[PDB]
Design a protein around this ligand. Sequence first.
Ligand SMILES: [Zn+2]
Lengths: 70, 171, 386, 426
Amino acid sequence: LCLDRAADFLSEPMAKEKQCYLQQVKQFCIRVENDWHRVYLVRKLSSQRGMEFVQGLSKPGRPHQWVFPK
Amino acid sequence: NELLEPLKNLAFSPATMAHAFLPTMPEDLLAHWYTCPNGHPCSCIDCHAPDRTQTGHVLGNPQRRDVVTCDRGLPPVVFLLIRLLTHLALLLGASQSSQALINIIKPPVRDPKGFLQQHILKDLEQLAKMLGHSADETIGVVHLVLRRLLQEQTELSTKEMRNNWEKEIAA
Amino acid sequence: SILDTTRLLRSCVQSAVGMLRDQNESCTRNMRRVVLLLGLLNEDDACHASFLRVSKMRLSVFLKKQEESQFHPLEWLAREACNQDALQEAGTFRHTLWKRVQGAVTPLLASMISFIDRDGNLELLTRPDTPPWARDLWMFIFSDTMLLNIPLVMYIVVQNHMNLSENASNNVPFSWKIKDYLEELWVQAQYITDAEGLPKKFVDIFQQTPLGRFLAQLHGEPQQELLQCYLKDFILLTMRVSTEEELKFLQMALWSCTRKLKAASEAPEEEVSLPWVHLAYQRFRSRLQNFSRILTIYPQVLHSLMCEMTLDAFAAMACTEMLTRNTLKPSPQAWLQLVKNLSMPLELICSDEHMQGSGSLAQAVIREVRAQWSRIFSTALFVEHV
Amino acid sequence: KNGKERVPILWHFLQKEAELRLVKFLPEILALQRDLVKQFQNVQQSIRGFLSKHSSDGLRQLLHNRITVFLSTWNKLRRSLETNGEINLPKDYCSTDLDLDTEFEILLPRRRGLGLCATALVSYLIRLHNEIVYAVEKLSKENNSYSVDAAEVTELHVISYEVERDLTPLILSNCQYQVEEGRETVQEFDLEKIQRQIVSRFLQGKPRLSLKGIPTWNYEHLFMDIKNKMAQDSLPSSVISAISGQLQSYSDACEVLSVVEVTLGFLSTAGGDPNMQLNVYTQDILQMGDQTIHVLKALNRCQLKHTIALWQFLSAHKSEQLLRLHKEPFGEISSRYKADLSPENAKLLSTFLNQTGLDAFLLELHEMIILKLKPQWSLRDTLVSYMQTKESEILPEMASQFPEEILLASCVSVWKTAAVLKWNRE
Ligand SMILES: [Zn+2]
């Protein structure tokens, strides 16, 4: 549910609360060392906004690259 | 199929459909309360004495569009798909002749292409909500509908014929 | 001296009342209106004399306002001379001028009547059994142009809010205006103060108002009576009632709520004013609405009933007992529907989120009502399914 | 799942869910409308301007919140009212989102003009409510009507809910998940339980929208009200001759007419006994004494059931007097109706008059002039229309002899001619 909330936040085309939440979620995905969390985040973001937006995030110079596995 | 002829016009001869009824219209239901001979509604006291169906494209800002409501006995999903096909044909026509679609669209607007594109995006969102599938799967559902309309084998000058065409395309 | 203003008014009463219309189509109201007016437009007692004086003062204010939007209002007689139609219609010049004053005073008198004959308030002035405080408050509100502000129009309709019958009158004069004034002061205090402290600020604001300094002079029996009366009228202005026993039960409930508030009042139980009524209602609005909905769904509770609000809990217990005895009667269909319609109110009563700070009395009543409603509801499910 | 027959209540609720969500605001908008009506009653005549005249912070912000609620509701279902609305409205109204800079007429509930908007909205809301209730009733199989009319509606008889606090939880508790062995998990919605949990409403309402009315004189309305509340009649020949002889003066006629007008008003408001003498009703029930000195001699024979006719006669008489003196009896009438007639028109009018009762014709024409014309319309079409609207005794003379060539732009003149002829006979 947390990853779903984060994906809905990142799907928005963000005032001191969603930013802190996404930062905490990034720290969590970095710390827990689990690929499945990032996988589910990617899958939800895709189901929300097509795989084209996901692949666009996959490009260099993007602020949402941690969503992808290593 | 002949059911594709109206759309064809809207896609290649929209000028012929400037006075046509589209499936994307509320279809005023009136055609309780009473009306005085002066034109004042009352259920006299106020005055002391005892169709509205538009044409063309009468949907306003796509933003305020939230929920799809059908008043002609059709499922909301099929109604939405029909509206989406209609919007695609209207976008094709605009690209072909922008002024025809500007006259069809009520209230008029500057850029018909972006108008219909936003309508299509809102339609896809509503369809994904009312079907649960992903965005890609919703687009694929539209592609499936188009495939079926192709494989299977007028000008909507009348509201009744418009509703009949809606029923046939839904079937 | 220049004019017999009394006879002028008394001559314009019929024309003033013939321009009034009652929303509820009160037929016999106009005749009683003119009768009470002719009886009050006198100087027999100080009451009639004060009525007449205040009427003349208000009419003079109205006429001055009207004349301000004119050119040479002193030159009205001349305009009546320059106008031949009025002369040939009235005959003599004297009668022309008399009729001019009459036409100037008729609509103003009619508006004043419409604003002081809402819900049969005028009866309070004439009924001999009317308490003294009632007449005093009537004349105070009539003499306070600031409070009983009457806009000037430049036909008429009387806004009868309460559903009083023929010859029935609000127990408190100008109850509607007092209610509106209190609501205005309440919203003001709310905008000006916190969530807590609003009661005290509202009470103080009202006590500093002329109406409050006046009602404070009433001590003992009258005060009590007044309060009671107000509550009654208050309910009639807020809740649509069916019978008088329902109104009495709601009045007792609201009085218990007011006693509860005033007991937790930051102050001794000195005297209960009107603001406490509004505070109690706002506090226990949902409970009272629920009690009324119960009395409406199962009116039999009324005849099945015989510091703190407990009428709702006892009404729920009565409903439970009746359904237990009337179980499956008059037949499974009507009984089940009645149980369903009472499900939400009893569930509300049978819940801690709606009752707070109540007494172990109401707590025990709610406990028994729950132990009974579980039974009734299991039976109702068995009915509606099996 | 063919729920239209398996779960009709849920079907109808889901169809109009987005619109039903707004019914919870009907109490607030109705309270605002009632407050405005109370404040703006007995007054013939923007939102930002209406708020500007409130230095009261509390009441200012309260009214502003109510107005904002109303405007949000209106804009949310503005288009719906344009088509799916029993009350017809022009497209310009339901075509633009409104704000505090909008005209302060929409908020005022009226049956014509911008004030219709509010009314319409309310109706729609009520309708929606009613509809679902009907459905519930169609599922209840017992016609228990708890009708609570608009005069008193709180947040207890209106379908009020929240999608993200009431309905979504209710649904997330019926998405029963089922799992076989060797087959992937599956959802299933217990539709019947959803309907049962949603149908826990059991309430009803009705329309009695609060409004004011446009005007706040039409003697026609008074006459109709009296005829509905009372039975009238026509003055005989004896009473006519008596009043004519007694009322040799304009002032006396006008006094009698003032008494008649007061009586007409009181009767329209309440009504009375047709056969009760007029002087009696005036001196006893109304106490119209101290000024009925000479009038009583004329109204000794007149009953209340003659009042209306009396009025007419008196008025006519007055005009007639002014014509015997060569004065102007129609100063209040538009001078456009004062166009003279051509010789052929004069001959036709003379022919029609010689074959018609001058007295009744003059009375009816004067009544019509004073009630309506106070030009090119047909004095034959509109005249028969006015006569049949009141179920009057349609004579054969004027219906089969009135020269249609005569235009209404000279009605008065025509009338005048007739009077002159009468004055020539006497
Ligand atoms: Zn009308």
